[PDB]
């Protein structure tokens, strides 16, 4: 019985995993949302600030679809992010390699939906000057696909408000506002427009 | 003695046979087939308390225990082999994660687990962790108080359930010469809902009260 | 249909990659790599060790006959993205780094049907620089060469589309402002070897804001 | 003959490593690992965190029947060097480390025809130590235990050749001088397990030069 | 093309060499090897007087020769040599004996093999090693030394040789915090009371001061 549930899952996974990424003819849309945990450090000597957050990522591939009834009513499953394609979303203004704080495992559901929530620590270019005043300091960093134009990967948010509800209450810095906004930008390298979600944080000393 | 040397050879052959048989992977737990992970903490040292960033550094090891049917075997079929140590990469392990780390955890111990014939698995990773903590008052008689939650990152309370044996973090190995003394340390199972997921997730809350020695 | 384009792309990649791997350039079959720099930030200048840390991305471009395909055979697919591990990439290396380069970006390249390849790794580099004068109107000047480590100019040759480093993306709040940034192809002779090595010399003049 | 010596050695390694594969020690077939330490340097003593950083060589010796061979069948080859990854190695772990150890030497071991292995990894270790007193004539005393993480004494037992740490490579110019260094086998129980675990206790007494 | 045949030959060569036969077991007493070694010193980056560690940037030139890497160019379309990944071949275990940190690799690991079985390999490294920099702010400067050599092979298996005993300073960074008074690289033979076999290292001695 409980073996039957396993047999069906191993079945489903084996049937499935036997994807070249998106293209202009097969475009993929990624929904991004940020949950900001902490502003760990603000370095005025280098103008770098360190964030800890979660990035929620959602997209859909028909190549991931299946009929639950054939697979014993299995709606969804966890799998290693290595077992599937995942999008290349990248901070455009990092000063160091992002460090991954959580297991890389995604949830795949029968309709082809994939949901993935990497927690990360990020050092990025920010000038904290004013962080000790009432107005505080403002910094911004864009997140987007590195190699994929708007014609291939589109970016969406469900809300322009960063989720602050997990922000660390004892942080050295308190958040005044945090917004996540979709943008369309052009770059020297390429004629095609690239999409980003601009994360803007306004913060000050506690 | 030829017999004794033949005996040792047989045990080896028996062990390899057992390992090859079992490793011919388990998909992970499901709402249909939930799994309970037992968890306890042994706190060795509070290495550093950084009042400039509100990050605190711990060294500890977590005992993880769980049980799987697919890891069961009859010892009499395998020459009285009750248990074996095996690389942790060889088997499924739980994704237990600090919820409030500021840096990737650094692994201080070999990752190898003990598997027993009833399907029991024991695993004790030792770790150094930076997590979010305000050590204000650490220099005071009552010291400072910090907390960090550990639980599965991707599996709700319907897939992975957590339990402790005791609510006392084990202090018997705590470094006597540490810069910080422990006023107390407890480990408590909790149930919480998070915005991303409708299902409740379980964590074990490590709460530590400490001050400068 | 979108299934077909997907089927065609997978087929195209299996044909190009599974049919071994280009062993690299040779005296018989040399290769020109085009290089250009986009300077995002001067993060840190350490006057105690004389190391400066740059954040930049490096555009690299080259072309291999063995990467060509006829689009009409493969669905009029004119190009694709592929992981940089699936193809040969040039060994371009800073000659005066003090630390291993840190990669800030996904490593994925764009291959085109004419066989051209385009790749843009973003990197943080610590290199040897004396920031003395950085506090003055004139500022400080430093230079670092980028070139193949193992391939002389009979094997790999280097080219720039301009001698002007791209500052369009330079961080406006950086501790350091850039006075000038140039990138210049050099034919460099080393007494170790009979054959010249080719590099692109990056020269940055900068000062505290 | 050079090909023959080479050919014999390749055959030997193939015979050994393709043979029916030691799954590691068990209670039925326990193992004694001999451990000795050669202290190179005390690099750093941090009194703000109570950590101390040590550089040292750890000599490890054990013997497996499954590694035995007759030199005669193999051209009188007595011993060979092999990658440490080609064989089983013990899990010896420092019990008090505050950071993952950093390996300073290649991982290659020597295997001799009696089944003996000799493996000497060089390491930099940060471990828990209170430096207090280091600046006095008495100096400071610190201790760290090394033993198997996952194997009880019924599976792995330890021994030393001497109670005396080898000080012959200790760096003459170190910020710290060594007053005494000992290495002593201990037996110990831990909350986790009924079985005793064996460790070798490294005790160092030191002060500022 | 003829450029197409060039690729086929090279590939044919590399396969015949690398795929064919057993992996080179490494040198032995019966089949000993000589490694030639030289240092080009680029920079003294840092001198820490609180830990007595000094950080060097340099590249090493390593050369050795193996019969198992030989080929006749005529057989192979007259290719006299090629570049190959260092993972494709055996490389020597040359190691600093007095380092305090894992060496950091600054250069692509790729070596050049020539038809006579000769290999040249030029790793660039940043190395922290035990050095007391005391006197660096004086006129006579500081002197430090570090030995390099095989970790696991005695003089009977691996022998070391230098082309010159002068460290190459021609590439030294002229704006370095530290200026070099002298740098030498000298072969040394050591014996240990236990054993008749010699042990071989190249001793790098550097005298330097604040610029
Ligand atoms: C692998 O290594 C082994 C062991 O070292 C070598 O085997 C030995 O080979 C040497 C060289 O032939 C042999 O040395 C000879 O010993 C003879 C007497 O041996 C007898 O008695 C012994 C026991 O004491 C028995 O084990 C053995 O079977 C015999 O019954 C001497 O009479 C020889 O001396 C004469 O010859 C030498 C030159 O060979 C002259 O210089 C002397 O002046 C004299 O005329 C000789 O010294 C030895 O016996 C072998 N040992 C065994 C046990 O076999 C292998 O050769 C080696 N394989 C290699 C290197 O390929
Ligand atoms: C001509 N041409 C194209 O049309 C599309 C390319 O797409 C692939 C790509 C694009 N980028 C960059 C990374 C960073 C910088 C600007 C933007 C696009 N960015 C912010 C996301 N990195 N890889 C391309 C890549 C290299 C050379 C020419 C190219
Ligand atoms: C809609 N939805 C689900 O119903 C269940 C999911 O479960 C998998 C999962 C859950 N989490 C988080 C990681 C961190 C934050 C909250 C909690 C759960 N947490 C503390 C462990 N990360 N991945 C899920 C994942 C991504 C997007 C939508 C989802
Ligand atoms: C004579 N000869 C060769 O022609 C090519 C060699 O290999 C290619 C190579 C070259 N370099 C270095 C890297 C850096 C520093 C100086 C120059 C040459 N550089 C700027 C490109 N590193 N690897 C080689 C290797 C050892 C001995 C003689 C050699
Ligand atoms: C009941 N039981 C056993 O009998 C044997 C086990 O052996 C495997 C093991 C044991 N340790 C620890 C690591 C550290 C701390 C105590 C000691 C043993 N230590 C100093 C070496 N690490 N892995 C075991 C593991 C987890 C839970 C119960 C167990
Ligand atoms: C008896 N015996 C041998 O004859 C040869 C061995 O060769 C392997 C080896 C030797 N070394 C060290 C590293 C450093 C310090 C001394 C020298 C030899 N060193 C400078 C190269 N590191 N690995 C060996 C290894 C372990 C136990 C006994 C041994
Ligand atoms: C190689 O060079 C030789 C000259 O010695 C020439 O005869 C030959 O045609 C060339 N190529 C081959 C494959 O022999």
The helix or strand, by DSSP H or E, that contains position C6, with its residue range, turns out to be: helix C2-18
C192 lines ligand 4 (CB under 6 A): yes
Domain boundaries, given as residue ranges, for chain E = 1-211
User: E-strand spans in chain B?
Assistant: 35-50, 55-72, 83-87, 97-98, 106-107, 112-116, 118-123, 126-132, 144-151, 160-163, 180-192, 201-212
Angstroms from B30 CA to nearest CA on chain D = 29
Q: Which fold is adopted by the domain B1-213?
A: Acetylcholine Binding Protein; Chain: A, (2.70.170)
Strand partners, B129: B58
User: E-strand spans in B18-117?
Assistant: 35-50, 55-72, 83-87, 97-98, 106-107, 112-116
Q: Does domain E1-211 have CATH number 3.20.20.210?
A: no
Q: How far apart are the first and last CA of chain A?
A: 56
The answer to whether residues D139 and D179 touch, using CB atoms and an 8 Å cutoff, is yes
In the DSSP assignment, the letter for residue E157 is T
The helix or strand, by DSSP H or E, that contains position C75, with its residue range, turns out to be: none
List, comma-separated, the residues after which chain A is broken, a break being a C to N distance over 2.5 A; otherwise answer none. 18
Name residues whose C-beta falls within 8 Å of residue D199's C-beta, 6 or more positions apart in sequence: D95, D145, D146, D147, D158, D185, D186, D188
State the Cα–Cα distance between residues E18 and E69, nearest whole angstrom.
Answer: 9
Angstroms from D149 CA to nearest CA on chain B = 7
State the Cα–Cα distance between residues D141 and D139, nearest whole angstrom.
Answer: 7
DSSP 3-state assignment of B10? helix
State the Cα–Cα distance between residues E185 and E201, nearest whole angstrom.
Answer: 10
State the Cα–Cα distance between residues C25 and C22, nearest whole angstrom.
Answer: 8
In the DSSP assignment, the letter for residue B168 is B
Strands B201-212 and B144-151: antiparallel
Asked if D100 and B107 come within 8 Å (Cβ–Cβ), the reply is yes
Alpha-carbon distances, residue E113 vs B122, C151, E25, E69 (angstroms): 50, 13, 18, 8
State the Cα–Cα distance between residues A13 and A6, nearest whole angstrom.
Answer: 11
E45 lines ligand 4 (CB under 6 A): no
What distance lies between CA E185 and its chain's CA centroid?
Answer: 12
Report chain E residues whose CB lies below 8 A from the CB of D6: 24-25, 28, 31, 68
Angstroms from C1 CA to nearest CA on chain E = 36
Residue among E9, E71, E74 whose CB has most ligand 7 atoms within 8 A, to mutate: E74
Q: Of C39, C206, C188, nearest to C129 (Cα)?
A: C206
In the block, which residue shows the tokens 């050099």? C186
- CA nearest to C48 within chain E: E177
State the Cα–Cα distance between residues C123 and A96, nearest whole angstrom.
Answer: 8
DSSP 3-state assignment of B76? helix
Alpha-carbon distances, residue D109 vs D62, D84, D162 (angstroms): 11, 6, 22
Name residues whose C-beta falls within 8 Å of residue B103's C-beta, 6 or more positions apart in sequence: A99, A101, A121, B55, B129, B130
The answer to whether residues E131 and D173 touch, using CB atoms and an 8 Å cutoff, is yes
State the Cα–Cα distance between residues B41 and C193, nearest whole angstrom.
Answer: 60
Q: Of D150, D165, D161, D128, nearest to D195 (Cα)?
A: D150
Q: Name the CATH superfamily for A1-206.
A: Neurotransmitter-gated ion-channel ligand-binding domain (2.70.170.10)
State the Cα–Cα distance between residues B122 and B116, nearest whole angstrom.
Answer: 9
**Resolution, angstroms, 1 dp:** 2.3
What distance lies between CA B207 and its chain's CA centroid?
Answer: 16
State the Cα–Cα distance between residues D78 and A20, nearest whole angstrom.
Answer: 53
Q: Of C192, C202, C131, C142, nearest to C166 (Cα)?
A: C202
Strand partners, E43: E57
The CA-CA-CA angle for residues E56, E60, E63, to 5°, reads 165
Question: What would the DSSP string read from start to end of E5-21?
Answer: HHHHHHHHHHHHHHTSS
Q: Name the CATH superfamily for D1-209.
A: Neurotransmitter-gated ion-channel ligand-binding domain (2.70.170.10)
Strands C122-128 and E53-70: unpaired
Asked if D2 and E101 come within 8 Å (Cβ–Cβ), the reply is no
Count of all residues that appear for chain B in the document: 213
Report chain E residues whose CB lies below 8 A from the CB of C48: 46, 177
The helix or strand, by DSSP H or E, that contains position C125, with its residue range, turns out to be: strand C122-128
Distance E24 CA to ligand 7 centre (A): 30
- The first and second tokens of residue E66, run together, are 């193996």
Distance C190 CA to ligand 4 centre (A): 8
- Give the method used: X-ray
List, comma-separated, the residues after which chain C is broken, a break being a C to N distance over 2.5 A; otherwise answer none. 19
Strands B160-163 and B35-50: parallel
State the Cα–Cα distance between residues A137 and C19, nearest whole angstrom.
Answer: 56
Which among D50, D103, D156 is the top mutation candidate for probing chain B, defined by the most B β-carbons within 10 Å of its own β-carbon?
D50
E112 lines ligand 4 (CB under 6 A): yes
Please provide residue A31's backbone torsions phi and psi, each rounded to the nearest 5 degrees: -100, 125
Please provide residue A85's backbone torsions phi and psi, each rounded to the nearest 5 degrees: -70, 140
């Amino acid at each position: 019985d409980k073996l039957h549930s396993q047999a069906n899952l191993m079945r489903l996974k084996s049937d499935l995993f036997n994807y070249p990424g998106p293209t202009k003819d097969d475009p993929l849309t990624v929904t991004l949302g940020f949950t900001l945990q902490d502003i760990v450090k603000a370095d005025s000597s280098t103008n770098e600030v360190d964030l800890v957050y979660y990035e929620q990522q959602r997209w859909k591939l028909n190549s991931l679809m299946w009929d639950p009834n054939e697979y014993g009513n299995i709606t969804d499953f966890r799998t290693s992010a290595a077992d599937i394609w995942t999008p290349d979303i990248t901070a455009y203004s990092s000063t160091r390699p992002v460090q991954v704080l959580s297991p890389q495992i995604a949830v795949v559901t029968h309709d082809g939906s994939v949901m993935f929530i990497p927690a990360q620590r990020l050092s990025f270019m920010c000038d904290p000057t004013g962080v000790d005043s009432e107005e505080g300091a403002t910094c911004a960093v864009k997140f987007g696909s590195w190699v994929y134009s708007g014609f291939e990967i589109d970016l969406k948010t469900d809300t322009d408000q960063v989720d602050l509800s997990s922000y660390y209450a004892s942080s050295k810095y308190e958040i005044l506002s945090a917004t996540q906004t979709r943008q369309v930008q052009h770059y020297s390298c390429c004629p095609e427009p690239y999409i980003d979600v601009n994360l803007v944080v306004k913060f000050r000393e506690r």
